Amino acid sequence: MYLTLQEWNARQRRPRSLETVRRWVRESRIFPPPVKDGREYLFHESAVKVDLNRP
C-alpha cells in the first residue's frame, strides 16, 4: 500500500523532474533509499526528502 516514485513526488507541494530526484538520492537527501528492483525503484511510504537537521 505504498506509493511509486511518480506519486511519491505528487505528495510534495513543490516537486521537480524525476531524474532530478535521482540526484537527491545520490546525495542521500531521501531516506530510506528506494528498492533497486534490478532496474525499477519502489518508494516505500517511508521515503521522504530530508532538509538539514531541524525536524
What contacts 39, CB < 8 A, 6 or more positions away?
Answer: none
CATH label of the domain that carries residue 9: 1.10.1660.20
Q: Mapping DSSP to helix (H, G, I), strand (E, B) and coil, where does residue 40 land?
A: strand
Boundaries of domain holding 37 = 1-55
Burial of 8 (C-beta count, 10 Å sphere; 0-12/13-18/19+): buried
DSSP 22: H
What contacts 33, CB < 8 A, 6 or more positions away?
Answer: 25, 47
Helix (H) or strand (E) holding 9: helix 5-10
The total domain count for the chain is 1
Q: Do residues 52 and 14 make contact, with C-beta atoms less than 8 angstroms apart?
A: no
